[PDB]
Every structure is written in structure tokens, then in C-alpha cells.
Amino acid sequence: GIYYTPKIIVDYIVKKTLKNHDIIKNPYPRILDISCGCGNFLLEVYDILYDLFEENIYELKKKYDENYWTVDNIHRHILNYCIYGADIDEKAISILKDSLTNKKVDESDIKINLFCCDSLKKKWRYKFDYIVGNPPYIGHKKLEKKYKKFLLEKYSEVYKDKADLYFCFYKKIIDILKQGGIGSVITPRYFLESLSGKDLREYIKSNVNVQEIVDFLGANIFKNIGVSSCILTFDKKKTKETYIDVFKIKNEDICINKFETLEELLKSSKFEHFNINQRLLSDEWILVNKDDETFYNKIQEKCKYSLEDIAISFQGIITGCDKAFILSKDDVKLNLVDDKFLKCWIKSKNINKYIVDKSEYRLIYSNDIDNENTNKRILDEIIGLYKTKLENRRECKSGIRKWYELQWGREKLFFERKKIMYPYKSNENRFAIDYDNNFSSADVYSFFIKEEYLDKFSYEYLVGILNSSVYDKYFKITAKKMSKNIYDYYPNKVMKIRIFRDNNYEEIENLSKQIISILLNKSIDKGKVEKLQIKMDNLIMDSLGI
Template sequence: MVTKGISEEDILYNPYFKIIDPACGGGYFLIEAYDRIKEIISKNYEQIINNHPNIKDELAKGVHQFILKNNLWGVDIDKFAVYMTTLSLLIKEPSKTRIPNIFQGDILLETKTLDCKINSKFQLVIGNPPYIGHKKIDKEYRKKLQNKYQDVYSNKSDLSYCFIKKGYDLLENRGRLIYITSRYFQESQSAIGLRSFIKDKFNIETIVDFYGSKVFKGARISPTIISCKKEELKQQKIHIYRLKDGVKVNKDNLDINDKTFFNVFTLSQSSLANDGWVLLASEEKNLFNKINEKGQYKLIDICVCNQGIITGCDKAFIVDKKTIEKEQLEQEIIKPWIKNSNIHKYKKDSVSKYILYTDIIKDLSDYPKVISHISPYKERLSKRRECIKGVRKWYQLQWGRELKLFEKPKIIFPFKSKNNKFIIDYDKVLCSADVYILNVKEEYTNIISLEYLLAFLNSSLFEFYFKCVAKKVGEKLYEYYPNKLMNLKIRIGSDTSEIINRVKSINEYYKKLNNISCNREEILMKIKREITYINEYFYKLYDIRSEEIVTIENRIFNVKEIGDKEMNKD
């Protein structure tokens, strides 16, 4: 980052090249900048004096003092961080006593005090501003941020968004901003204003997207490195370096130009949408657009999606068969229960847990044993927000949903997964909040069946289509939240009967696998053939060419071999 931000030409042209880190912490970037500038000046000392004779006397007093006085500025709200940065710069040459331009204060709001101290515009703003979500920010402080940074900061925004706007304000024209920040801003609803601001005010030069990987030790977020210049917009091509799915790198073996690890491509700045930045190479973007254009119905128009049950206290409401038998719990209230981890592509694990669906209780005396089971948790349950408000009774589930939602055939899927895992549940299972439920709207049931919809959702084509816009969380996981999923489209073939039959066959094959005397290998091969047929059907339906299939398979890894490991592990 520092090498990109400070070139030899920059210092030769302007030895007074000014750099600021507005949230300097322990001074990592400023120390790197010091070393970089000192190296350039030492290497080109005579040339710099020849080009700028007026600085000869100042440089003669020492390069160290020159850099601390003229090149480096830092601010941090934390007193100890300021002390550490100051000390780290001073000990570069302990015999010199020049105090660096490092100040304590809130650079976002203490503008009058700090502006007087800084009193400058900068050629480079660099840093790793703090990522602090709205829930951790004092309400009054949040209001002040909203007032001062209304272009980029809304009620649910991250504090780091304000540092991008502040960075812009600190820059001179044609100055450069380079930040490591959370990649979350590329997709978050709360960052619409920020994305619009960056796109309109900056020329974006590069984006290094680590795509869910936590590259830096101890960091809780997956970072993006963004480099952009404060200048009038032109027809700008952004250089994108996107970490390949599933690849592990760390800061010690990081080479963004290594195509073993990174997808490297360019895209037009004008193609970035304010509602979310989709960083795709041209062949991926064209293929995504092709699939999208061939879709006939948005899923949100033909389907209804609901979240599973929030119990408010799993220990009270979730039981196993042994507990049911031992305590002789009333059967009427006991329902089968599954979680995120129980769902696989076309298959769910056998039920081993059950939920006490207490929302159907009208008279506590009808279910004495169930009430006896949950009574030890009464105090905790009574403190739930809904109980305090009087919306729920203490023995009820926090959000139990309507029972009829679960009692008909439905598609269910985990909200986080490394690949598409959709199943049809015919067994009236209830599911936890980490599972979503999908059903076709009544008025569309004569147009599309659950089986056809399931085949599409589990196809390689749809997995590619979805992952182009999905939010990546961690090295392998994607969020299958409805806000992205339901806005994608589906194309319905003229005759869907064969696909429906194939899905039913897969379901039957999985049932046969429960028989310990079955020929497991043979059945798995049959399942694989059915899935291959379904994939090829959708490729043909969408007119996907062979080279486009390669793009799809590369994007989703093509590693989903059917076998015991696939069925029993995420």
C-alpha cells in the first residue's frame, strides 16, 4: 500500500509530499511511509537538491527531521496509540528531538481543533480506519455523525464510512486515498450513500477484494483494499484483484498479481451500481446478464419466503427422543426439528431433535409435563422482549410462525452455506431461524411445481447465477438471504415433466440409502446421473455454450462429487 501511494517520482517532483493517517493506531503505515521516503531521498539526494535548491539548508539539518516536519501526519482518538506512534518515529533517530505531527483527537468531529493543528491538504491519505457497527456507537454520537456525514452515514452505517468522506476532505485535488477497510461496504444496504459518494467523487484505481478471507491475523473482518484519486471523473477502468473462492492466503505470501490466487480483470467504474458493487470479469458479467435476461419470473413474484422459528431459548424448547420418553412429554405438542447443518443438496439428515411447539397451548393444565419441562427456564423466558411487552406468554416460542407454514410440502435451505443446498420437505418438519422456507404462491402452482423449482435452485447454472451477487462470509460460506435470492429469475421449460420425475427419483434413491443392505455405490452413481441430467437440461434451456459452461464450473469449483462425504458434511 505504501509503495503504491508513494512513488519515487512523487518525492522527486515534490519533496514536501504530505501524508496523513487519520486513524493511525500504533503508526504502522506512517512508519512504513517514513522508511519509504527516507530511502527515496537518500538514494536521490543530489537530484532532489538540484531540482529544489530552496530545500538544501533544511535537508542539511537531517533527512529524519525533514520527514517528520514536512511529510508525515497522524491522528488517533486513543492517547496510548498517539504515544506509540510518536515514540516509534522518534526512535528512528533517538538523538534528534523533532516531535512528529501526531495528534490526539476525534478527527471526525473535533474539526476546529485538529484543523488548526493539521492546517494542510494532503497528497496521500492512507490507513485502516476502525470498523464499528451502529450498535456499538453511542446514540448521541451517531446523531452527530449523521448530521456531519449525511452523504455517507445513515442510522445503521459503519463508522469507517465517515473516514472515507473525511479522507476525501483532507485530500488536495488529484490526491490519493488508500484504505484497508471491510469489504462489507461493497454490498451492505447501509452503504448505498457511501458507494454513490465514492463512485461520484473519486476515480477508483484498484480494488483488492479478499472475498471473505480473513487475511490479516486477528482481524474479524474480510478486508478490501481500495485505492482512488480525488479528481474529475473520466472513462475510468478499475483494476480488480479478487481472491479466488476457497483460496487461502496471508499477508506473508500475498501477491495480488499471482493468478493462482487472484482473478485479475478490469471493469468500468460506470458499471458499479449504487445498490451494490458486483465485481465480475467480463465473461462472468456477460454470462450473468444472459442468464438474468432469459429468466421469465423473479422468484419474489412467484414464491413466498419465510424464516424459520426463533425459540428464544433452545434449551427450553428443543428436546431429543430420550427426553421425550423419560419425561413422557405430551405428544400433540412435539414436532420434528432440523437446523442449518441438517440440510444437504436434495437430502436432509434423519430427525434427531424435536421442538415443543407451545404456541398451540390454550390451557396450561392440558400439558403439565411440557410445562414442567420448560418451567426451570421461566425466569429467563419471561425476560424476553416480547414477553416484557406482553406480546407473548412466558411459555410460548419467541417467534413460532404459523404452524400451517410447516405442515405442507415446502422447499427449505440453510441461510449460510458453501454451495446450494435446497431440499423439499414432505415430512412436516419445523426448522430453526438459520433455515429459510420457500413455497410457490397459490396462483402460480399450475405454472411451476416445487420439484421443478428445486431442480433449478440446485443446478450448477443457478449456483453460478446466485454466487455472482451473493454476499461472501468467510473463506467458503455465502449468505443465502432472501433479499438477494428472491430477486433472481427463473425460466420455465415448455415441458417440465421429465425434470419433475428426475427430482422424484433422486428423492427415492436417497430413501433407499437408508437401507443398510443397499448397493450404496450403485445408488450414488444413479443420483449423480440424475443431477448431471438436470444440469445439462438447464444449460440447454438457457442456451449455455460449452465455453460458458467452463466459466460456470470454474466459478463454483465443480467439486460437488456425490458420496458419503458430500451427504454427511457441509
């Protein structure tokens, strides 16, 4: 339940909020960690504060109560007035209390402002100058359902649907940050692009000035943790310019301890820096350099259609228990299943550019099983081996589905037709024409072209441009970066891809057909495909004027 932030990042975040604090003008800064754990951030805040007071102790002594400002009194003053922390874990607070106490070697006891509580429910009696830390990340599946009711009712401005718990910590931190205060936190990066984070992005943009965003993309910041990180620094200062510094990593393979400090890494060639006008952020935050922005805007202005305009999108089958319904095509159990019940089944790894690998699995479309007495053998010997787990699906407990039915079987006729399929998570654009009525789970998305757009766009033309290097770069500008070399390819962004028709349509389509013809050969010469792709990329770059 407790996660250790790397020391190099903790030091950076504390320095970010405190390095320019005028301790002479305000010797009572309130610094808060809203989920402080064992005190990774707060113990470093202590050290930074102690040097700050000690370096200026005589100036404080002269300006203020000279009996109060002595070096021997710095420890007590820091704990009474400056350091605040809250965490749900009682043991961690106890350890942090000891660590703060042991900063100096009984006299009258010193009150330490540490609270064991739910920070999202605490009645905070005052605002804070500086707020730092690493909040909990809990998504919609791992969050207890009784708690979501409170979040949906009290944090509705940032928390709906598939939002994350750390959205609410952003809201709490902002709300209790003083005027002129500064906050700096490390959270997942996904809210920067995700559909769920739209409301949170709106809340940040209109309530604070975002000073800086450090985007680590798919780098592994937390050892043995499958998460992708970013650092946000923001303030409530009266400013006029409100430009954001964006530091975006260039190589996801770096080990974070390259230098003694993080700011050395940010200035190095391992990162790129650029500025974004906060006032120009739409509901989407497009955080790219001027070359990429110029590139993105050209494509948007040139393309008159989007995929959503011309296509019908849908998510794949969700059986609710794949082991009950999915069998290898050579499994002897399939002799028990009438072939009218069997569908070809593919995984995301089966989707290549332009074409799908031949399927090795079969789906039992159990929705078409009329009743339990007529296909008893299928139920008793195949599906019923998982009857307990099948019965625990939500729609079976409510009686909407029979225990042997697919949870979300969708419409068969959507799959049993010519269509385009693509993996839900990939390192690159992989859009394939499906000729074989393939079904799939939710790791593969599909679409088909609307009837009224068939005479403007063909499937062969679409996989041509969509698989091109231009469109690979174009999609990744705004795509959701998930983990190292993985982007989400979900309809909420894939269907926003814009497309064009011009004089190059026929040659692009013809090149795509040549590629498809070679790829479907037995003795395929993969080499010529790459040359045809290079030729097609040139046509597309000519078409879009890049």
C-alpha cells in the same frame, strides 16, 4: 482493540499511494492514518518518505531554500509537515510517538501530528494528499447503542440499519481527501455485495475514482480473526476513463507470504485480473470477468420470472433462547409437553439438495400455552430453567412478550405446509422440498409458491434447476462471500434468482422426481443421482444457451 496488519499488505498500501509522488513538485505531502494504532502504516510511510527526500535532496536544495533542504533536516521536516495520525487509544499514540522520535538519534523539540481522538468527530482543519490504513470494524450488535445515534444522524448517507462502523470511516476518508489525492485501505469485503453497503457503494462511486480492488474472498488475511478482507485504492483525480483494476483471488488456501511482496502475488496464477467500467456500476457492483459476465447476462435476459415474483419468502423462528425451547426428541422432559405444542426442528446442516434429514430436535411452541396455571409443569421444569435470560429479551422488558413466549414465533401455518427450505450459509446451493412441516431457526430460510403460479412452477421443478451446477455458478456470481467456502444464502439475494419455463420443463421436472425418489430410498444408490444430475445440467445449459 488493536489489530496488526500483515507487513506485506502494509507495504503494498503505502507503495500504492506514494510510489509515483513527485517530491520535487510537492515536497510537503500530507499522509494520514485515520486509526493508526501503534503505527503499522505510519512508520512505513516514514521510511518511504525518508528515501524519497534523500534521493532528491540536492534537487530540492537547488530548487528551494538551500539551507532548509539538507539530509540532516529530513527527519524534522517529515514529522512537522508530512506524517499525521489519529487513534482513540491513548497508549498506542504514546508508543507511536516514541517510535517516530526514535527514527533519529535534546535540541528544540519536534511537533508530531498525532491526535488521540474519535476520528469520526474530530474537526479536521485541512484535507490530505494521501490516506492509508485499517479502520475499526464494528457491526450492529457490538456497537454501543449510544454511539449509533450520532452515526445515524451525522453519517446517514452511508450508515443506516445494519451498517458497519467502517462504512463511516470510508466516508470520513473520502471527505478529507484532497483534490487529486489517493486513498488506500484494507476493510472487510462484505460491503461490495451486502444490502447494508448499498448507500456506501453509491457514496464511493459518485465521489472518487476507484483505481483498484484486491478481493481476497474467504482467505484468512488476519491470523485467528474471522473476517474476510479486501483492499480498495481510490483517488480524486480529474480522469476521463475511470476503469477499475480488479484482482480476485483464485485459491483461498494460500498463505500470504508466498513472495516477498504482494504485487508478486497479484501478478501470479493465484490471482485473476480484469477491468470494470465504474460508469457501468449499478447499485450492485458485479465484479466478474467477461466470461462470467456473458454467462450472467444470458441467464438474466432469458429468464422472465424471479423467485420473488412467484414465491413467498420468510425467515425461520427466532426463539431468543434456543436452550429453553429446543429439546432432543428423546428427552424425557417431552413427556411433560402435550404433543399439540411440539414441532419438528431442524438445523442448517440437515438441509441437503432436494430433501431434508429427519429431525432430531423438537420445538416447544410456547405461544400456544394459554396461561401459567394450566401448564405449570412445562413452565416450572423446562422453560423456567432459563427465566432470567428469557426475561432479558427486548420484547419481554417492554412487556410485548410473556417471559415464556417465543420472541419471534412467526405464523405456524407458514411452516405447516409443503415448502422449500435452504441453509442460510453454505458452500453450495442446497434447496430441499420439505414434506414434514419442519420448523427451524433463522439458520434456515423457507419459501412456498404463490397459488397463482402453481400451474407454471412446481416444487420438484424448482429444486431441479436451483440445485443445478448452472444455478450454483449463477447464484455465486452476485452472492455475498462470507468466509472460506461459505456464501450467505439470504432472501435479499436468493429471491432475486431468475427462473424460466420452456420445452425442457417436463424432462427437468421428471429427472428431479427420479432424484427425489432415489434419495428417499432406504438402500439408496447415490451413484445414479449424480448421473441424473449431469443429465439435468445439460438440459438447463441447453435451455439457457450456454
